[PDB]
Symmetry: C5
Subunit: 265 residues, 5 copies
Amino acid sequence: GIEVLGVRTGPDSTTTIEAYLNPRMGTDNGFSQAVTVATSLNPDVPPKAELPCYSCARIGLPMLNEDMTTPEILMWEAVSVKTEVVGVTTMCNVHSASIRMNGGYGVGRPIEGLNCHMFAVGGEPLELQGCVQNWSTTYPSGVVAPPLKDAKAQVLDPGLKARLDKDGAYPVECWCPDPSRNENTRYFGTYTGGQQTPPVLPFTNTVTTVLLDENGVGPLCKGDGLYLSCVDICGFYSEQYSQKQHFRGLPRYFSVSLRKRLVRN
Amino acid sequence: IEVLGVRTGPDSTTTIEAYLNPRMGTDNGFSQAVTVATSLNPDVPPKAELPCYSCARIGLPMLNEDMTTPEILMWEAVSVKTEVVGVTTMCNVHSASIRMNGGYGVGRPIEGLNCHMFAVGGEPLELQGCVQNWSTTYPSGVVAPPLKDAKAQVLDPGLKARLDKDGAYPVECWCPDPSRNENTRYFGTYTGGQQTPPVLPFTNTVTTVLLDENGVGPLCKGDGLYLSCVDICGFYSEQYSQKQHFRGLPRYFSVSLRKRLVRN
Amino acid sequence: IEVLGVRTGPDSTTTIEAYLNPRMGTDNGFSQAVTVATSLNPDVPPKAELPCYSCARIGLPMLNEDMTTPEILMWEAVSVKTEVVGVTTMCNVHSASIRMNGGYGVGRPIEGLNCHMFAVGGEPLELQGCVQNWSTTYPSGVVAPPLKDAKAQVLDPGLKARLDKDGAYPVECWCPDPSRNENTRYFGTYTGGQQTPPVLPFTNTVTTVLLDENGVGPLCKGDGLYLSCVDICGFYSEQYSQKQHFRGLPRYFSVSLRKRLVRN
Amino acid sequence: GIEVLGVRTGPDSTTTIEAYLNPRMGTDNGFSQAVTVATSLNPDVPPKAELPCYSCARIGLPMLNEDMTTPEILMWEAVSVKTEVVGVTTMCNVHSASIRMNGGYGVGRPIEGLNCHMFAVGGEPLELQGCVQNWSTTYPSGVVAPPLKDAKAQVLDPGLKARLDKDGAYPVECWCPDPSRNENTRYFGTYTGGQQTPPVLPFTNTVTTVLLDENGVGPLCKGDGLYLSCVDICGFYSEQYSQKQHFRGLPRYFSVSLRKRLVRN
Amino acid sequence: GIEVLGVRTGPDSTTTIEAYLNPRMGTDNGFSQAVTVATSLNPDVPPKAELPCYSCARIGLPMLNEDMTTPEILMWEAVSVKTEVVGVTTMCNVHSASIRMNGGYGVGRPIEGLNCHMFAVGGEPLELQGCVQNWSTTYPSGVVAPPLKDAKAQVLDPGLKARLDKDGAYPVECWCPDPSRNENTRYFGTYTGGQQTPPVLPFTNTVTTVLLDENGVGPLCKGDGLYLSCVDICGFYSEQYSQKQHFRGLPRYFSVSLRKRLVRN
Ligand SMILES: [Cl-]
Ligand SMILES: [Cl-]
Ligand SMILES: [Cl-]
Ligand SMILES: [Cl-]
Ligand SMILES: [Cl-]
Ligand SMILES: [Cl-]
Ligand SMILES: [Cl-]
Ligand SMILES: [Cl-]
């Protein structure tokens, strides 16, 4: 319910924000703890250190309205983003103690298997819908999980909603971007599953995503905050000896172009 | 229908939002553990093991104060944004699947054959009957084509239906009828194989335009918008038994409509 | 043919709808169980194990009661919408296939090599003979190229035919002739390998335009529209014997035509 | 070299050339001899009959200049090509004595594995750069192979150059199109590797490749010759009993559109 | 930032630079030494001969500015590049002593597995961000590796920066292009992982990459130097007997088209 007026131009009417988000795979430096697997659907008690979570940050922008009593005020409008997964070339490492190919004689398996990549740029926290594979899962304290009162949580229960308002706390497996909300956020997600699937990861500085909607309006930054969200699961690392697996995530870089937009107060 | 001009001005457009939960054979995203015949006859799949199409009819706002005039208005579906919801649930490798690396690694994610379809129309989706095995005995509580001979394994033009009941028309014995559906747009993809990686996008930035060559979208007969889908995402394998279950995910729809004048 | 102007006005356009059922070696979507030679000679594939091209000539409304005038009319095919029918049958994993997960999981779906072709023309599709094994003995009841030497394994320009009989020209010994077919458009894809996932779209929203670089579609000689296809979707494996059968699916065609004036 | 002037139009100013090249996989009829494999890098002595080679032909064009002493002359200019791999549907054969699937009970493996497809259209022979996987390889009598004096032949040694001037004589594995030359040829190549990779082979008569460069100039046919080159390795055939493998290649059709082009003489 | 003025046209205002870079896989001629694999994360001591490194070269350009104090000066602007991996067809070799398919009876495995391809064109050295898979790795004498003082080196530690200023010295696995810098370079990278993944390698002379940014400005060559960078890991070669694996890399050709650009000094 924001009445959007004209773009405000002139000196200092545009700015570019640069930020990076480190991955939250369950521990702080790119890997989950070795993943444990329940023998049945109940009990199913995944430790916090084994659950990849969304990354998020609010970037404070230059204050626009010392006076909020005028019939019009200014908002920062996100018009475009360049975003990069950082450290893709680390997956050329086949010497750091993974399970060896060619019956033990070849190199270590690279990081491989299921991939899940999402980035989002908005003027407020990303809106989430709760959904899980197993409604009987006992989620750990210190992650935010939807309430699991019945099996409808395995499909769409519209009572299960959240905002992505804490970095490294909302597990990827029990929340997805809510397509029924997020009027003021653009999100872009991919999942490529399978067991030992080859990760396919580009890295270029030449690609821009335009964030304008049908009316030529980008996300409008409420309270002069820019909201960045992502997850970048790149596959599993297998330990050579134990053969236990760890999620591997990589950091993401954002460059967001903003302009001043007049709106009705 | 003789299609005339778009009616513009206040309240001439609306957006309909809806979601459809998947009908994989039980109500909460999974089939019952799938059984497999030892021969083509008898072949008796239980209802709880057969994925079915999801469908809904949304009653639309009143737009005609009279239905006897030489022109009337219909809601015209211009575009749709649609999303498979819960794609990130497939990052779960702890909930009691068959373990990789000889039992030492994580559980297999949901994987294998995928079948994704959505449709938006102004009347029920029209189906053509077709089966893999004409000897199959379909269960009580589903709508299956009559199977009188083996031509049901290819195209028997006698085997037609309308998708008019949610969770009742099995995916494996009906497909969208390309000879009908003048007033519905459908979009389907099948990706088969045994352990195939599911590839599932999730974004709020992609719009499908529903206009035909003449610039006319589906026209909502009886002020009904008809949504249909299936989203089989693969199989869940039980760690101990190694039995498999179909997994389906819900689908969200946002449909943009405008008022269209037509000859009555 | 000297092609002149498009004839417009009432009844200047028509749409032809047709379907072709697959010819995999038996009448209802499957080959007989496939046998495999132990050497290149003898190699004697039965007719029931050899997929063949589907084809039909559709009679169009007669245009020229008088064929003596300096100009006459021909039907010109401008576009086609075509669909493989029954794609969703490949969601069936209960009808007696080899079971995954060591016998505990579902049946393998139909998978492996795929070969899909459709063609629309104003005369029969022109074929080039080419085989994998020049020593193959092709059976009675199919049309196969003569095999007098091993050049038949590559391009022997002496080996030509017209697709003039439904279910009679094996796919493996004939391909569309790129040196002919001036008056036919053909569109073919082969995806090989052993257990390869079939990837099969099904939509009513995709149109193929048949106009050449000069804006002219196939011209229907003698008021005949010629439709051809093959749709090998993979192999079905029998649970017990583990023998394999080719699976094919039917194909639907909707062809838009317009009247074109030509010099007589 | 050539100062390019105007396109010559009017009657007889255009022509279409149709040709086919049969594959040269090591024997004349689509297959290599069964392939033998060295136990070490030295000695490594591949027989000619086991080495796929490039196909090539020069097509004579209508003679344009009885008098080659005028200040301007005409050249045939290649503007576009339609090209097709012929015999793709042969790969639906699963009965002709290959290794059987389903533990011997199913159909024969189709032709599968590494694919290499190239076509080229030019106004002079295709220019080649020598490059090998093993500089210790002894190439056979009856093929043209680069001299192998040191291991730089495994990467780029700019001393190792050739012209594709003989059909079925230049092995694919020791020559590639030279990107530093070929000003007057367009080449188009794809390699898809791996062990049992599915071949993906289109066949249509509806696809045209334009051969014009950034200046709107196609290959200019020196001496009224059109030069066609290709290779089409479609994978390996496995013999049911021995399990030895043969390269399989398919023939390629070309239709080339030419127009008369005035040049400075 | 440079204030960019008009393109300078006229005779000698454009030039084309051609160059090739041979790969640096750990030895001089296209292959790493046989790769060794640690049994644990510490110690993990990859020899230099087993670590693929980036290729780079500075190409000297014609000197533009006799007086470097004028209010405007000229810079060479890179507007487009044609780039080719050379030697792709060498991967059709299945005779040179690899592990044999069909249980020893078939041909040798071709080069296959993880691929990593990057090319970059800039007016200064490519800027790098340090990131590793294992912060406990001991990088060898003779390579430039980021300092590894804690596990943040496995994600984005913004302290870990470098410039690609030496050919065959910066390992691919511990450096990636820095998306927070490189304003004056265009880089284009792909990684395709997995164990035995088919390499997919095109080779054509018909494809041009435009290097102009959103404002129509290509990289500007500081000190009249053009900076070229790449890596082309094409997979692993498996030795038939030992079954040890070697990285295989291929050389890359560049053709860069430049024009003179006026800039405010
Ligand atoms: Cl303003
Ligand atoms: Cl941090
Ligand atoms: Cl529900
Ligand atoms: Cl029939
Ligand atoms: Cl002229
Ligand atoms: Cl010949
Ligand atoms: Cl100038
Ligand atoms: Cl060098």
